[PDB]
Amino acid sequence: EIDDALYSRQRYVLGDTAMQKMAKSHVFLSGMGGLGLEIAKNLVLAGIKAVTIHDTEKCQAWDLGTNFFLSEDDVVNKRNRAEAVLKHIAELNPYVHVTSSSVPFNETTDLSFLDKYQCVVLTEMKLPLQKKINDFCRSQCPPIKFISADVHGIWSRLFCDFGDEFEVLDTTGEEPKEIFISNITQANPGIVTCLENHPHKLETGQFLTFREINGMTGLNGSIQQITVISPFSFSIGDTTELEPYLHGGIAVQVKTPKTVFFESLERQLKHPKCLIVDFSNPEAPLEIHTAMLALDQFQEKYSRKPNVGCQQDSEELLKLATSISETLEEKPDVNADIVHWLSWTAQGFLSPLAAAVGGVASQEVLKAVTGKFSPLCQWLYLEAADIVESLGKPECEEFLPRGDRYDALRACIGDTLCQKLQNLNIFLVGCGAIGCEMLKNFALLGVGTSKEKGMITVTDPDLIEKSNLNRQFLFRPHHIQKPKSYTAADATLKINSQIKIDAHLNKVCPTTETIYNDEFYTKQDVIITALDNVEARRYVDSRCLANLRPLLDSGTMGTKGHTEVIVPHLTESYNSHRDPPEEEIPFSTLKSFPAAIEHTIQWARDKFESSFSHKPSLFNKFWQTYSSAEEVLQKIQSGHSLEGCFQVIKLLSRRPRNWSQCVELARLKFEKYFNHKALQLLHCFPLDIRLKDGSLFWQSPKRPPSPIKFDLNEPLHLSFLQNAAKLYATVYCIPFAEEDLSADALLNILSEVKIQEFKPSNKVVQTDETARKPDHVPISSEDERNAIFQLEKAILSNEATKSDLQMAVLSFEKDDDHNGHIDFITAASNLRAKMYSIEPADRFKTKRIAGKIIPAIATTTATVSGLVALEMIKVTGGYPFEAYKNCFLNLAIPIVVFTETTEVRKTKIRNGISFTIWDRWTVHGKEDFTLLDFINAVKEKYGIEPTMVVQGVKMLYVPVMPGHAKRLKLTMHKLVKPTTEKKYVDLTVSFAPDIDGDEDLPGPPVRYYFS
């Protein structure tokens, strides 16, 4: 049913149940403006079963600046907008069935037909009809989920209503957590101690279940409500009547579906529940709602939007707002600034804000149709007032329409900023879904369309994949395996033929820094990143800091996302921020003492790596190095020691010669992994073995394993052996057919297979946590002689040909299901889980964890893209510091967090002289200029005498070190030995602290010029 090859990322987000719920459901969408178009695109990407778009308007030239499917031909033909776009929308997802309608909505229009839709979304509608439709929807049985959203210039309104009661199945959709129990007290209420340095991160009132408790078997399977006492403690209710705590136990999070209560739209006017996006001005959203209501009343009164530059319109609107505020529950003070700006820009349309609101509202429709997350209750008022705020007091000439496609945007931000936008030269790194949305935004904004200066540069090396069609909407299935940037630029050309773009198929890295040299950065104005990993982000941040250019970064996963802004001399840089690295699983944990399913899947993954990539490559490279097995035999006979040769030889002795031999090898490997390991470990540690403190060695987090009895009939075992045999045949270049995987043939083979008996040994076990993988074990001469015997055996059997010395080397593909990599990893991890009494995991979760595939969804991408576009608008405007806003959000709650960005910090070194990360010093001079002259020039220009000198690793001068103090006589070029290609050289200096003996305070990097 569910096309994982298409849906896998969002499948990791919402869950297969959600997909089977967007299936069988039907949604009605009306308005088909820019906002409605965004909704429709987001939903069809998401894969809702069927969508009915509605629009009665005719095509206009004004619609072209906000619609990326309309063309001038459609306006010429005066077609219906929905009719024109219907063909293009269906291209995004053929699985969805899409219909169009144009029945005008009015007072006499009957709404009974709407019952076929479980959710209704309205855009570009007059308010009383919205009231009527909301009433009809919420009066239905079941009530139709109602969503309204509007955009007016820089202002936007979003509203939601799912009826008076709505059941949210999953509140926020995270993985439930598990915490090992350190101790439980017998008290009323009993208090449970978590494992030390493992905080539970829970909430008072949350519900937990328990299992494996030694002592309290009764609460194993019980559910209690907690009351957080400490990060490692909380009360769980009375335990006095119970047994003493012995040991063990694990508490597990319990999810409970909840009920959320909405209100009718008309009633919500007086008492609007408003989500907060900036806690510094919590009352502002109420002001925004008041202003929008005043605009609605204005449109009711005059059948038109207020006109820019009309002082009478602004006065009337302010009067209306003041009258309306008196009718409000709280009666907030009317903000004249908001009213003035709305009157100035009511008729405009700002595309990025519309895109962001569209993404958010679409995610709300997903919430409505699935119950997967807590919905909005009930209002949202996003805005970009800061953009026009920096404009001071402009006039209408900037915003007067000029007959072009950009008239809506011009009415928003004025023509001069449009000119600047068309003249921008933008470098975009990475062209993922975020990149595609940025391209769409630029095309809508006309960025770079100016032939004078405009140029959009983008680069990305990866090819298009079917799995990327879900989010990277610019592409089509016939674009698979083609360069991403090329197809993206081609598609963007369709959106805006005036645009100018240059695509590259290159990864951004220090190796490619030659092409992306500092001059190339100098030509650019802005840098936008749609990267996936952090290291590339830090490298790009270093390049941006070197070239002193603004940089915008964003990252998304699941419903969570964030946007961050860097401005020279204004903000801190990404590398300034630092975090602890990702947690490395302990070597003893992953090798011998797993405790979580993640440990087992990790073990499966690296065992797969060793068995199919690493070891075969070692074998092949070894035989590339050494010509013949007889040569190796001669060398070993003459006492030669070749690193890892012994493993190569043992590999040779293990080479199967037919499919049945591969099957036998797989069976033996199964035995070794899941039977012999447990037996060996238990021989080393019986369940009754105890520590010196008298406690049992086997306790949490350690888990005593058990050998697994082989079973041909087990489907898990069948899949495991099948994938193993397939992989081994692939590596050893042994052909086969699918009938070889039949249980009949496998049973036939295994009837002859004899299993060698287990033999316990006494290998040293790195049971300690701190232990890590050591060096190679010194192979005894007995093992060497055994290998020699096997070697001459192979030589006599003539098994020394080039084919014997060559084998296939694989790579971990995850998207192709037929290679069986995912199947093998799943089988191995599940089997290892049963060894340690751990519940198995499904295939999709296994693929997610092993491949480290980040869950993603189109709505979050669109929203973060809109935010990034707004911030790029601000930085291109050269706005003051306060305008720029870092933002973090989580659609699950949902929650939006705006904040002022991190201000750059200034560090004083001496005499009040302070500098920043942005600052770099420069000097000029001559060849015969000396180091002492350099010190003097520094003390002159910057009022401070250098105390130590280093150029990279060339540790140049310190007064205290004897042999280098005399270098002050030497000139620069003979001393540092620079590369003459440059006219200069860069250097790092620090200054002795005001209190001597402390560390020298480092200054900014300084570049000295030879001339």
Ligand SMILES: O=P(O)(O)O[C@H]1[C@H](OP(=O)(O)O)[C@@H](OP(=O)(O)O)[C@H](OP(=O)(O)O)[C@@H](OP(=O)(O)O)[C@H]1OP(=O)(O)O
């Ligand atoms: O070399 P690795 O892939 O890291 O794994 C090795 C390997 O097992 P595989 O053969 O299945 O890869 C060893 O066997 P050889 O390659 O040397 O034949 C085996 O040693 P034994 O054959 O003596 O069991 C050893 O087990 P250990 O490290 O416990 O001695 C095991 O390590 P892991 O299974 O933990 O990776």
Ligand SMILES: Nc1ncnc2c1ncn2[C@@H]1O[C@H](COP(=O)(O)OP(=O)(O)OP(=O)(O)O)[C@@H](O)[C@H]1O
């Ligand atoms: N150093 C780099 N230079 C150029 N492009 C890069 C670099 N690092 C990452 N990218 C690009 O960043 C993009 C990130 O977008 P996205 O998450 O859609 O990637 P993906 O590989 O298609 O997806 P997935 O991570 O789900 O496999 C990738 O398409 C990748 O090509």
